[PDB]
Design a protein around this ligand. Structure first.
Ligand SMILES: *[C@@H]1O[C@H](CO)[C@@H](O[C@@H]2O[C@H](CO)[C@@H](O[C@@H]3O[C@H](CO[C@H]4O[C@H](CO[C@H]5O[C@H](CO)[C@@H](O)[C@H](O)[C@@H]5O)[C@@H](O)[C@H](O[C@H]5O[C@H](CO)[C@@H](O)[C@H](O)[C@@H]5O)[C@@H]4O)[C@@H](O)[C@H](O[C@H]4O[C@H](CO)[C@@H](O)[C@H](O)[C@@H]4O[C@H]4O[C@H](CO)[C@@H](O)[C@H](O)[C@@H]4O[C@H]4O[C@H](CO)[C@@H](O)[C@H](O)[C@@H]4O)[C@@H]3O)[C@H](O)[C@H]2NC(C)=O)[C@H](O)[C@H]1NC(C)=O
Ligand SMILES: *[C@@H]1O[C@H](CO)[C@@H](O[C@@H]2O[C@H](CO)[C@@H](O[C@@H]3O[C@H](CO)[C@@H](O)[C@H](O[C@H]4O[C@H](CO)[C@@H](O)[C@H](O)[C@@H]4O)[C@@H]3O)[C@H](O)[C@H]2NC(C)=O)[C@H](O)[C@H]1NC(C)=O
Ligand SMILES: *[C@@H]1O[C@H](CO)[C@@H](O[C@@H]2O[C@H](CO)[C@@H](O[C@@H]3O[C@H](CO)[C@@H](O)[C@H](O[C@H]4O[C@H](CO)[C@@H](O)[C@H](O)[C@@H]4O)[C@@H]3O)[C@H](O)[C@H]2NC(C)=O)[C@H](O)[C@H]1NC(C)=O
Ligand SMILES: *[C@@H]1O[C@H](CO)[C@@H](O[C@@H]2O[C@H](CO)[C@@H](O)[C@H](O)[C@H]2NC(C)=O)[C@H](O)[C@H]1NC(C)=O
Ligand SMILES: *[C@@H]1O[C@H](CO)[C@@H](O[C@@H]2O[C@H](CO)[C@@H](O)[C@H](O)[C@H]2NC(C)=O)[C@H](O)[C@H]1NC(C)=O
Ligand SMILES: *[C@@H]1O[C@H](CO)[C@@H](O[C@@H]2O[C@H](CO)[C@@H](O)[C@H](O)[C@H]2NC(C)=O)[C@H](O)[C@H]1NC(C)=O
Ligand SMILES: *[C@@H]1O[C@H](CO)[C@@H](O[C@@H]2O[C@H](CO)[C@@H](O)[C@H](O)[C@H]2NC(C)=O)[C@H](O)[C@H]1NC(C)=O
Ligand SMILES: *[C@@H]1O[C@H](CO)[C@@H](O[C@@H]2O[C@H](CO)[C@@H](O)[C@H](O)[C@H]2NC(C)=O)[C@H](O)[C@H]1NC(C)=O
Lengths: 53, 96, 105, 43
């Protein structure tokens, strides 16, 4: 009864570094100069169409 | 934009940007090989015979049929596999 | 190698090794007790004396067996057939192919 | 000429090495210092 890994015929598997972890941290996407970002503060906004605030 | 009443002296031999084209094409040619495969397990002992053909002793067959050991996807098991090459890529190492 | 076809029907006689490259077949026939006799000298060419309906496989096909197609058979075609392939990859055949015999009802 | 009180600072090591061909391997020797090699645990 001899087995093998399932990825033996597509790719060598990069082992993840056990030093680095996969917890999420909050990323803030900032716009460069000359650009702005607009956020819609309307409560009943279904994400399509004109937002009033 | 077609000019008027103007004249400059040209020289194709001391010209720039042909060197830049040469360097750009060489480096771009090198850049299209880094994702591709290196043939490290392939420089190996090749058991080659003549191609199956009506052999003329005065001329030479331009195809050699070579079988060899090759590593499989598994490191423990290795296989025997054959292929065809030309004379201009193989040389005899020094019966068998 | 015994092939029997009630007379007036068609007939397909295979002979020799499978083709490798371009070939030039030669079909001979042999009545019992007689000398041999040419029937086909090219892939699909016959000389005078032998009539038509003795068709041959063309040599431009790669990786097939040489066949011999006979329609409207008779008691005269009851003989031993022989093939002589001339492949452009295999060497010169100083011996003929295997004896394929035809017998009729 | 070995002195038993002192130590020779050069060890002459031969070993298996892969050739340019993957099937054939060769026996090749070299010289190193004491400060680069260690004894693993007669022979
Ligand atoms: C760069 O340039 C160079 C040169 O400048 C080029 O090199 C040339 O390349 C071509 C193609 O690669 C070669 O063509 C082959 O030629 C040979 C020889 O053909 C001659 O001889 C044939 C038979 O000779 C008999 O007839 C003549 C009368 O014509 C007679 O004088 C002689 O004594 C003898 O009795 C002739 O049929 C043939 O004529 C043909 O071509 C004429 C050109 O214009 C045309 O006018 C004719 O009407 C006629 O069509 C010529 O004289 C051929 O044998 C060969 O064709 C066979 O082989 C290929 C590959 O195997 C296959 O695909 C073909 O179908 C054909 O095979 C048939 O014929 C065999 C003949 O017995 C037969 O045994 C086969 O089983 C098969 O038969 C089947 O079909 C036939 C009908 O075709 C049918 O009757 C059968 O029953 C069966 O069904 C090629 O045509 C040149 O030789 C070569 N060199 C030169 C100097 O030209 C190069 O290509 C160029 N490269 C580029 C990129 O441009
Ligand atoms: C497969 O390849 C072989 C080659 O190894 C080839 O065998 C050769 O066949 C030809 C004819 O089928 C033989 O005869 C020659 O025919 C030419 C045409 O006329 C002659 O000019 C030749 O004479 C020269 O060579 C002689 C020595 O062989 C000399 O005595 C003479 O003075 C001339 O110099 C010759 O008669 C030929 O001999 C063989 N080759 C050998 C080495 O025997 C065969 O036909 C190929 N088969 C297929 C199916 O393609
Ligand atoms: C190659 O290396 C060897 C070392 O393994 C070396 O052999 C030594 O040679 C010397 C003389 O050639 C021998 O004699 C010594 O000479 C000195 C100089 O006078 C003395 O002081 C020594 O006396 C001490 O050691 C004695 C014990 O050996 C004690 O009894 C004494 O009280 C002193 O403590 C000594 O007589 C020396 O003995 C040998 N070494 C050994 C281990 O025998 C050889 O010469 C070298 N060859 C070359 C070509 O260089
Ligand atoms: C090249 O050589 C190989 C052998 O290493 C040939 O493969 C054999 O071909 C014969 C003839 O059909 C078969 O009976 C064997 O079973 C084949 N063995 C394998 C492992 O495939 C091959 O045909 C040769 N190719 C050419 C072009 O000469
Ligand atoms: C197989 O290839 C070898 C070469 O590795 C052939 O040996 C020589 O080939 C040349 C030209 O191909 C001839 O002129 C020599 O006469 C050959 N040497 C001998 C001792 O005959 C060899 O002929 C090829 N064919 C076979 C069947 O081994
Ligand atoms: C492929 O690998 C096999 C196994 O190592 C090789 O076969 C050996 O060849 C040597 C030299 O001819 C013999 O002394 C061994 O007895 C062979 N062992 C086995 C198990 O066959 C073979 O030479 C390699 N190459 C090819 C083309 O098959
Ligand atoms: C070869 O090297 C070994 C060390 O791996 C030597 O063995 C000891 O060496 C020290 C200092 O060189 C001496 O003090 C010891 O007395 C040596 N041990 C023994 C059992 O003699 C060894 O002397 C060297 N030379 C030879 C010829 O083996
Ligand atoms: C180089 O490779 C050879 C071949 O494996 C090694 O020689 C083997 O050594 C072991 C252990 O001493 C013996 O059991 C084998 O019988 C030897 N085989 C052969 C063919 O000699 C050798 O130890 C390696 N290293 C050096 C320095 O030669």
């Amino acid at each position: 009864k001899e087995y093998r890994l399932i990825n033996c015929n597509t790719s060598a598997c990069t082992q993840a570094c056990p030093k680095v972890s996969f917890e999420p941290i909050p990323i803030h996407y900032c716009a460069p100069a000359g650009f702005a970002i607009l956020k819609c503060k309307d409560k009943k906004f279904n994400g399509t169409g004109p937002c009033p605030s | 934009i077609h000019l008027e009443n103007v004249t400059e002296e040209f020289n194709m031999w001391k010209n720039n940007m042909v060197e830049q084209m040469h360097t750009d094409i060489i480096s771009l040619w090198d850049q299209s090989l880094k994702p591709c495969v290196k043939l490290t397990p392939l420089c190996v002992t090749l058991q080659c015979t003549n191609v199956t053909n009506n052999i003329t002793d005065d001329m030479r067959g331009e195809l050699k049929n070579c079988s060899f050991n090759m590593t499989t996807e598994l490191r423990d098991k290795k296989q025997k596999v054959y292929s065809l090459f030309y004379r201009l890529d193989v040389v005899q190492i020094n019966s068998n | 190698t015994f092939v029997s076809v009630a007379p007036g029907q068609t007939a397909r006689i295979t002979c020799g090794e499978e083709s490798l490259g371009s070939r030039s077949v030669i079909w001979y026939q042999q009545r019992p007790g007689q000398a041999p006799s040419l029937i086909i000298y090219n892939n699909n060419d016959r000389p005078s004396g032998i009539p038509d309906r003795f068709s041959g496989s063309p040599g431009s096909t790669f990786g097939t067996t040489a066949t011999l197609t006979i329609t409207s058979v008779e008691a005269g075609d009851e003989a031993d057939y022989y093939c002589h392939i001339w492949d452009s990859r295999r060497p010169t055949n100083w011996v003929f192919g295997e004896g394929t015999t035809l017998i009729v009802l």
